[PDB]
Amino acid sequence: MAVQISKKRKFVADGIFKAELNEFLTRELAEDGYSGVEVRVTPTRTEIIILATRTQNVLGEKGRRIRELTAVVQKRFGFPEGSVELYAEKVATRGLCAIAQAESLRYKLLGGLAVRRACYGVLRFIMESGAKGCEVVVSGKLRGQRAKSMKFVDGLMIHSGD
Amino acid sequence: MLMPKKNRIAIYELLFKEGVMVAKKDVHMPKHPELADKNVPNLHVMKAMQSLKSRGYVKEQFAWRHFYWYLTNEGIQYLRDYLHLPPEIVPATLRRSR
Amino acid sequence: KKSYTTPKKNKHKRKKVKLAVLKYYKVDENGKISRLRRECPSDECGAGVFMASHFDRHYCGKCCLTYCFNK
Amino acid sequence: NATIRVTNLSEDTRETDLQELFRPFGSISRIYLAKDKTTGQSKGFAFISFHRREDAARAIAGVSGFGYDHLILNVEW
Amino acid sequence: GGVMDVNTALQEVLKTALIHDGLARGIREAAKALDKRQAHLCVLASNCDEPMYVKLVEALCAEHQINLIKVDDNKKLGEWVGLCKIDREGKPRKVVGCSCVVVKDYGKESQAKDVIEEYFKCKK
Amino acid sequence: AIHRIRITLTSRNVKSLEKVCADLIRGAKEKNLKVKGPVRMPTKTLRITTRKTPCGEGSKTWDRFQMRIHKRLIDLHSPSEIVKQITSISIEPGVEVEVTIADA
Amino acid sequence: QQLYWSHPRKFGQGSRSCRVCSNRHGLIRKYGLNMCRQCFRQYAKDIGFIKLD
């Protein structure tokens, strides 16, 4: 159980764990209203706070899904056994959570629905929830086999500076 | 073969115990370290899970050169009878998550 | 990239001839069992399998790199 | 059910008291106790973000109890 | 299970013997099993094959371990085996006669398995 | 006994770093552990200078990325118990700490 | 079957592989990369970096 890697390499390996997880989860919790994570190592314990809007579908009946997820991480990155501990979290104010708003629009569209009325419906929600402004783009095909672009915009926006 | 009859058991029994399997995408793995201990010199995990997946009984994710196979209820019934196990045993997990 | 051009041979895998099975034990009177050629002597061999009667070559088929007498 | 609602709480009930009387009974995510304005005392309503539904479904009348001033708490959805 | 009748007795073998992995099906595997001391039981069945094995099996039982049983109608024991394990002994996908089976310590040694063989051995 | 115990901090965020150092210097000086101040070490540059264009075409452009790490360490000399007690608690941000038995 | 399937890969551009899918061509090692320059860009937002210059 030693020694330990250089301080320069210490941050890179943390970043790789922070990033890989964040795309692992997005391919499973897409329908559950995923919105991110926030990792924290704590004394002799890992915390992985799995942020999603509806904790219901994440939990499952008898906590099956959360049990699957913990057993995965325990084998995959070769964690010492029983150190890993998951936690869930529900976010309040869901219209500032761009990641979830975009991935909700996805399943509305892929569910089979018109584009204009869908874009309007998501727009007023993120405006209502609080926001100076907001924007939506849909670039690709529709009504033939040449591509187009469709912008739906309301309020303020910024594009330059820090 | 396709693979021995010993090495089938060692995958199907190991899956039943953790409730989940994971592996990497390679074809030059020499003995497959990182469990199944030193008796899979080839694909075998990936090749046997895929056939199992064809007939349902499991789900499969894939992300950054790593598989993730999630056992399901239907496969628990199958594996329970297939390996001649008690009518109510799940050693993978069974408790309420708080 | 482009399609394969004609060969004038190809043959895949031999059919591993469909020989009659177990005549390796000979019975002329009972309870006697008349064994022919010696049963394989290695520790890792079980010595319940026969060795090849392959004269001018004498070879255990359970072995696959070792134990080839020839006389 | 949007909030796990608890009533009939004594004035000895605090966020940490409920955290205790819930944690070995299924780990919670957060208590929201009506602490009186400018007073740590309770008011009688508590919203318990238990973060779970399974372990709570597994027992309904044990957590209501376990020993508290010879009183019993409410579990409600 | 059984009452120590010959027919229900050989069925009781196959159930726990499967778990013990004692089944040496086919004449070649039966021979290697009984030429070894791993075997403890031999069962034969009606001729569907050559008149050589019927002689030879008695000859092997003589020298090494006497234990033989003969029960006719190959299709009975042929039906009792699966294609892997339990899940259909009916099964028009494949069913075929064993014609001989050899079992190692007659499978698990437990209940009625012990009694069926001990009943036969003292009278034979 | 009283051992020279070194509390090393390391971070990438100057706010998150510095206030957590301050907390440990107050709590130490409060208990008169004869604490020695922060020794701020040179901030190090990870540089990555790579193409901005996949499948190079068009005007040749690049992109400078940088990460700035920070190190600084406070040296204490006091019993190892009360140090290892108080150190690991009272840390809000994602900032690392490494305790050393002795160095001097 | 076969008695070979492989031949020495111990150094060179074929014995290291990059993490896109086992992609290459795009020789990479830096500071412990093993990470593909096209995707490195997409992880500018993700942690490891935030652009500041």
Map out the domains of chain G as residue ranges. 1-53
Q: Residue B96: which of D26, D28, D51 has the nearest Cβ?
A: D26
Question: Is G31 at the interface with chain A, CB within 8 A?
Answer: yes
The CATH number assigned to the domain holding E66 equals: 3.30.1330.30
Between chain C and chain E, the number of residue pairs with CB atoms below 8 A apart is 38
Question: Is G46 at the interface with chain A, CB within 8 A?
Answer: yes
Beta carbons within 8 Å of A47's beta carbon, 6+ residues apart = A39, A40, A41, A85, A87
Helix B6-18 × helix B45-54 angle, to 10°: 70
Give me D33's structure tokens: 């106790």
Q: Is there a contact between B64 and A59 if contact means CB atoms under 8 Å apart?
A: no
**Pseudo-torsion of CA C44, C46, C49, C55, nearest 10°?**
40
- CATH top-level class of B3-97: mainly alpha
Mapped onto helix, strand or coil, the DSSP state of residue C42 is: coil
E15 CB burial (10 A radius; 0-12, 13-18, 19+) = middle
Beta carbons within 8 Å of A95's beta carbon, 6+ residues apart = A101, A125, A126, A127, A128, A129, A130, A131
B72 residue type, one letter: T
Bridge partner residues of C34 (DSSP): C26
Q: Residue E56: which of C21, C27, C46 has the nearest Cβ?
A: C27
Dist CA A153 CA B76 (whole Å): 51
Dist CA F90 CA F95 (whole Å): 12
Give, in order, the Cα–Cα distances in Å from E27 to each of E43, E68, E70, E124, F87: 11, 14, 15, 24, 75
Contact residues on chain G for A13, CB-CB shorter than 8 A = 32
E1 lies in some domain: no
Question: Is B22 at the interface with chain A, CB within 8 A?
Answer: yes
The count of C-alpha atoms lying within 13 angstroms of the C-alpha of A148, restricted to the half-sphere facing its C-beta, is: 8
Dist CA D47 CA A110 (whole Å): 37
User: Is residue G33 part of an annotated ligand binding site?
Assistant: no
Dist CA F102 CA D35 (whole Å): 48
How far, rounded to the nearest angstrom, does the alpha carbon of residue E42 sit from its chain's CA centroid?
A: 5
Q: What is the 3-state secondary structure (H, E, C) of chain B?
A: CCCCCHHHHHHHHHHHHHCEEEEECCCCCCCCCCCCCCCCCCCCHHHHHHHHHHCCCEEEEECCCEEEEEECHHHHHHHHHHCCCCCCCCCCCCCCCC
DSSP state of A52: B
Contact residues on chain F for A13, CB-CB shorter than 8 A = none
D35 residue type, one letter: K
Give, in order, the Cα–Cα distances in Å from G22 to each of A16, A23, A79, A83, G25: 17, 18, 24, 31, 10
Count, in order, helices (H) and strands (E) of chain D.
2, 3
**How big is chain G, counted in residues?**
53
Beta carbons within 8 Å of C65's beta carbon, 6+ residues apart = none
User: Is residue G42 part of an annotated ligand binding site?
Assistant: no
Q: Is there a contact between F67 and A11 if contact means CB atoms under 8 Å apart?
A: yes
Closest alpha carbon within chain F to G40: F50
Domains in chain E, number:
1
- What letters, b where the CB count within 10 A reaches 16 and e where it falls short, cover A73-110? bbbbeeeeeeebebebbbeeebbebeebbebbbeebee
Dist CA F5 CA F80 (whole Å): 7
Contact residues on chain A for F96, CB-CB shorter than 8 A = 10
Dist CA A3 CA C60 (whole Å): 51
**Pseudo-torsion of CA G33, G37, G42, G47, nearest 10°?**
20
Give, in order, the Cα–Cα distances in Å from F82 to each of B82, E2, F33, F34: 58, 74, 10, 14
What sign results for the dihedral spanned by CA atoms A43, A48, A54, A59?
negative
User: Is residue G46 part of an annotated ligand binding site?
Assistant: no
Return the CATH number of A7-90, one of 3.40.47.10, 3.30.70.980, 3.40.50.300, 3.30.300.20.
3.30.300.20
Helix A116-128 × helix A98-110 angle, to 10°: 150
Q: Is the peptide bond before C31 cis (omega within 30 degrees of 0)?
A: yes
Contact exists between D and C (3 or more beta carbon pairs < 8 Å): no
Experimental method: cryo-EM
Domains in chain D, number:
1
Residue A41 · residue A47 · CB < 8 Å: yes
Between chain A and chain G, the number of residue pairs with CB atoms below 8 A apart is 22
Question: Is B65 at the interface with chain A, CB within 8 A?
Answer: no
Contact residues on chain A for B92, CB-CB shorter than 8 A = 71
Give me E54's structure tokens: 């019927």
Dist CA C46 CA C39 (whole Å): 9
Selected for mutation to probe chain G from B3, B24, B27, B65 (highest G CB count within 10 Å) is B65
Question: Is G47 at the interface with chain A, CB within 8 A?
Answer: yes
Instruction: Measure CA of the first residue to CA of the last residue in chain C; give whole Å.
Output: 53
Q: Is there a contact between G47 and A19 if contact means CB atoms under 8 Å apart?
A: yes
Chains that touch B (3 or more CB pairs under 8 A): A, D, E, G
Q: Is there a contact between A62 and B97 if contact means CB atoms under 8 Å apart?
A: yes
Q: What is the helix (H) or strand (E) element at residue F40, kind and residue range?
A: strand F36-40
**Which CATH code fits G1-53?**
4.10.830.10
Q: Which of F65, D3, C60 is nearest to G44 (CA)?
A: F65
E116 residue type, one letter: I
A123: left (phi over 0), alpha (psi -120 to 50) or beta: alpha
DSSP state of A34: B
Fold (topology level) of F2-102? Alpha-Beta Plaits (3.30.70)
Contact exists between B and D (3 or more beta carbon pairs < 8 Å): yes
Q: Is there a contact between B84 and E86 if contact means CB atoms under 8 Å apart?
A: yes
Spell out where chain C has E strands: 25-26, 34-35, 58-59, 68-69
Give me E112's structure tokens: 């009625």
Reported structure resolution in angstroms: 6.0
Q: Residue E58: which of C30, C48, C49 has the nearest Cβ?
A: C30
Q: Is there a contact between A87 and D29 if contact means CB atoms under 8 Å apart?
A: yes
Q: Which of C28, C65, C33, C31 is nearest to C50 (CA)?
A: C33
- What letters, b where the CB count within 10 A reaches 16 and e where it falls short, cover A31-59? ebbbbbbebeeeeeebebebbbbebeebb
As a 3-state breakdown, chain A gives helix, strand, coil percent values, each rounded to 5, of 40, 25, 35
Q: How many CB atoms lie within 10 A of CB A19?
A: 19
Bridge partner residues of C39 (DSSP): C50
Dist CA E124 CA F13 (whole Å): 90
Beta carbons within 8 Å of B54's beta carbon, 6+ residues apart = none
How far, rounded to the nearest angstrom, does the alpha carbon of residue E63 sit from its chain's CA centroid?
A: 19
Bridge partner residues of F73 (DSSP): F8, F39
Contact residues on chain B for A62, CB-CB shorter than 8 A = 94-97
Q: Is there a contact between B81 and E87 if contact means CB atoms under 8 Å apart?
A: yes
Residue B61 · residue B67 · CB < 8 Å: yes
Contact residues on chain G for A22, CB-CB shorter than 8 A = 46
